[PDB]
């Protein structure tokens, strides 16, 4: 896809020099991003591979300073 080309061209050309602070960089914001996605429909666990889905909706009460952190990142 197109986005694959953009991503691959943008990592291949920078991974030729940066080799210590690159995968650590782009893989770090994800930990914040997961706190932004509203649940509409859910999965549960009972015993180690059981599921029992739930139509529960949950909003995303994210504070403001983590956006400033994310912005710095």
């Amino acid at each position: 896809s197109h986005e694959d080309y953009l991503i691959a061209r943008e990592l291949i050309v920078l991974s030729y020099s940066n080799r210590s602070t690159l995968a650590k960089l782009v893989s770090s914001p994800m930990s914040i991003l997961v706190a932004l996605v509203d649940i509409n429909g859910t999965f549960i666990t009972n015993e180690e591979l059981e599921l029992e889905f739930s139509n529960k909706y949950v909003r995303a009460i994210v504070p403001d300073q983590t956006f400033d952190e994310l912005k710095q990142m």
Binding site: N40, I44, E50, N55
Partner: protein
């Protein structure tokens, strides 16, 4: 698509609080000149009421459309509360450094203060008009300068603004009584709110339309919407018994061949979770939404037939759809019950008024099973209105679970029988299949009580009455998903969290309030259209708007007939007080606005009589008339519906006096030479040749010193006489003092929209949770 519907539903924001920054105004003062009698012009000017935004179309139907649009404007400005200080401003000439209500009021007062041509009394009156307060009562009185109709609207918005004094008791009283009297929940708050505070009450008026009476396509969507919403709030089964630590106990109880677990000899099919929770969710959400549910099972699986008993006992039978339970009851009778007494299989009829349990209740002779089937057949809902809302309630024996004891009695009897007609393997299979439920008895009792408890608890959080009516689309229910729930359960209570309850209640409240509010909108415009004679107007797009603001339908594929029936029901609804009063305040002043507005005229007289002109004063001499008495009148909208220019042509060829009535344009003519030449009589000949009447523009003979030939009037001793006057009123004269009023308001309140956010809420420990009967639920072990 399932989740999307709930995304639309749960994104229903409440009714957005309105708050105006200015005052509704249609009029404004305006300096015009004044022409002293004999025609010549004063050095002085004079204030008059004139209209803001002269935009009236031509023709009467279009004018009534204008007033309908104006009614819509007034509704959109029509506020819910207001604090006059937020629009108040200083007065640049007040003795006491007071204030006035509007910026334009201050502009008026400061422009009238500067003119040479103002009395001293009015300047004093402006210096002495100020605000006042009385803070013990939190009341304010501001001055204002307002046309009377504008004063009427603004004063109505003052006296009929929907707010209520907020306190700490109404917060509690806003919750239904059942939750408050249920000891499993504890409520509190961390704030006291003053009596300066406010809150708006929703409109929780029940269905004025009876959409459960032959609006089945809408009721299906509604019932599905409430079902899928209810699925999002029923709790998850947090704790169970393991699914493999159970199945080995079941297998050894059944004494099955090794490694048939992966083949699933039909007892063991679909025992898993991911079905038990599905059943738990579906039953409760359907009974809450009153949605019919169909059953997809198999006859090789005898456990499905066995768990259908528990289902058809704990749940009424009028709650399912007919063919499904007919099939299921038939199967049960044919392979568990009639075989247990050597009876024949059955002879059942397709189009039979009775279901197999009914026609089986009288044939077989055993007391236990007979009374069980009696209970099942005559189980049905009980309608009852509580807290205003209708509710479909259970028997009060299902709730405090003892129905399961009748079930066990019947099943134990059937265990105790012999099967003479049938082999040993068959008997063995059946009796083991029902022993697997006997061993789960206490857990089943607890399950039944838990369903009943959660059902009534969630019933409490309903605002719209819940009718027991069948629906187009159903919900599938595999009985293996029942068997799972009935077999993977124990010592694990689930109570809906209070916040989920409050969420569900506010969602339903906001949905209901939106529903009533949009109904009120549609009812206002519909009633108004019928009372303003708007006859070319197809009352569909209004209904399209109505259905679009209820954010669950697909208006692109709903027809026109349902919309028109909805209109037909809406015709017969009383209009709410606000809209009705605003409309009856508009019906009594639309004409007085229409007597104003120098872009249309209310008629033209063609009277072959050399009549005198009137000594008005904003004009000099004009060919104007203000009564329309004497001459017979002809309505033009009738003539433009039905083109019959025979009458009028007859009247023109014979020079007969007449008046023509309807919103007509006009053109001012400051030429005396157009008066003696009589050009205004030259305009009506184009009506007989090209029979259209659209390019009809009579003349207004405004005469004054600004006319470039006026000197004749002031040299030759002739009063201006003329022909073919125009039917029009004059503007009214601006009396500053009589136009002044005092507007009242409350001083500095604060409006709180959400109402349960101040409540913090907690549950007793769900192991020790108790029902209405002062007897614990989830206690059997």
């Amino acid at each position: 698509p399932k989740e999307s519907i709930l995304k639309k539903l749960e994104d229903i924001k409440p009714e957005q609080v309105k708050k105006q920054t200015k005052l509704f105004r249609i009029f404004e003062p305006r300096q015009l000149p004044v022409y002293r009698a004999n025609g010549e012009k004063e050095l002085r000017n004079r204030w008059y009421w004139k209209l803001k935004r002269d935009t009236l179309p031509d023709g009467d139907y279009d004018v009534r459309e204008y007033f309908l649009n104006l009614y819509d404007q007034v509704l959109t400005e029509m506020p819910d509360y207001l604090l006059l200080k937020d629009m108040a401003v200083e007065n640049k000439n007040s003795r006491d450094a007071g204030k006035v209500v509007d910026s334009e009021t201050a502009a008026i007062c400061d422009a009238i203060f500067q003119d040479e041509e103002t009395e001293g009394v009015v300047r004093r009156f402006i210096a002495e008009m100020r605000q006042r307060v009385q803070a013990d009562r939190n009341v304010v009185n501001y001055p204002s300068i307002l046309h009377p109709i504008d004063h009427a609207f603004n004063e109505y918005f003052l006296q009929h603004q929907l707010v209520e004094p907020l306190n700490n008791d109404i917060i509690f009283n806003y919750i239904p009584e059942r939750i408050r009297n249920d000891v499993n929940y504890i409520l509190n708050m961390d704030r006291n709110l003053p009596s300066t505070a406010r809150y708006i009450r929703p409109n929780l008026l029940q269905d004025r339309l009876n959409l459960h009476d032959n609006f089945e396509s809408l009721w299906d969507t509604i019932t599905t919407s409430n079902y899928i919403l209810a699925r999002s709030v029923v709790p998850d089964l947090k704790e169970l018994v393991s699914t493999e630590a159970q199945i080995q106990k079941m297998s050894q109880d059944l004494q099955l061949e090794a490694l048939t677990i992966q083949s699933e000899t039909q007892f063991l099919t679909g025992i898993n979770s991911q079905a038990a929770n599905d059943c738990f969710k579906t039953l409760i959400a359907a009974m809450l939404s009153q949605r019919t549910m169909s059953l997809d099972f198999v006859t090789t699986n005898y456990m499905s037939l066995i768990s259908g008993m528990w289902l058809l006992t704990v749940v009424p039978n009028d709650m399912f759809i007919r063919e499904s339970l007919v099939a299921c009851q038939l199967a049960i009778i044919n392979t568990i019950i009639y075989p247990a007494f050597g009876m024949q299989r059955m002879h059942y009829r397709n189009g039979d008024p009775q279901t197999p349990f009914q026609i089986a209740e009288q044939q077989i002779q055993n007391f236990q099973v007979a009374n069980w089937l009696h209970f099942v057949n005559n189980n049905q809902f009980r309608q009852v209105v509580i807290d205003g809302v209708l509710n479909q309630v259970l028997n009060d024996n299902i709730r405090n679970g003892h129905v399961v004891n009748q079930l066990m009695e019947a099943l134990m009897q059937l265990s105790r029988q012999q099967f003479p007609t049938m082999p040993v393997d068959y008997k063995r299979s059946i009796q083991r299949g029902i022993l697997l439920l006997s061993n789960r008895l206490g857990q089943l009792v607890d399950l039944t009580r838990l369903l009943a408890y959660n059902y009534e608890t969630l019933m409490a959080c309903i605002t719209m009455n819940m009718q027991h009516v069948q629906t187009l689309t159903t919900e599938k229910l595999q009985l293996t998903s029942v068997t799972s729930l009935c077999m993977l359960i124990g010592n694990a209570t689930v109570i809906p969290s209070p916040q989920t309850l409050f969420h569900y209640y506010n969602v339903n409240v906001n949905f209901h309030s939106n529903y009533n509010e949009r109904i009120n909108d549609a009812v206002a415009i519909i009633t108004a259209a019928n009372r303003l004679n708007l006859y070319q107007k197809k009352m569909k797009s209004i209904v399209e708007d109505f259905l679009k603001r209820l954010q669950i339908f697909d208006i692109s594929r709903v027809p026109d007939d349902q919309m028109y029936r909805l209109r037909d029901r809406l015709r017969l609804l009383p209009v709410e007080i606000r809209r009705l009063d605003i409309f009856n305040l508009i019906l009594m002043n639309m004409e007085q606005i229409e007597r104003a507005s120098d872009k249309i005229a209310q008629g033209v007289i063609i009277a072959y009589r050399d009549m005198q002109l009137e000594r008005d004063e904003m004009y000099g001499y004009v060919n104007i008339a203000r009564n329309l008495d004497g001459f017979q009148q002809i309505n033009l909208e009738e003539l433009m519906r039905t083109g019959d220019y025979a009458q009028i042509t007859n009247m023109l060829l014979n020079n007969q006096p007449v008046a023509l009535v309807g919103a007509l344009p006009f053109i001012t003519d400051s030429s005396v030479i157009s008066l003696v030449a009589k050009l205004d009589a030259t305009v009506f000949a184009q009506i007989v040749k090209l029979r259209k009447v659209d390019t009809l523009k009579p003349i207004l003979y405004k005469i004054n010193s600004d006319s470039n030939d006026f000197y004749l009037v002031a040299n030759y001793d002739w009063v201006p006489t003329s022909t073919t006057k125009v039917y029009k009123q004059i503007p009214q004269q601006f009396d500053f003092r009589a136009s002044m009023h005092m507007l009242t308001s409350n001083l500095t309140f604060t409006v709180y929209s959400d109402l349960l956010a101040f409540v913090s809420a907690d549950t007793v420990e769900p192991i020790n949770a108790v029902a209405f009967d002062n007897m614990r639920i989830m206690n059997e072990l």
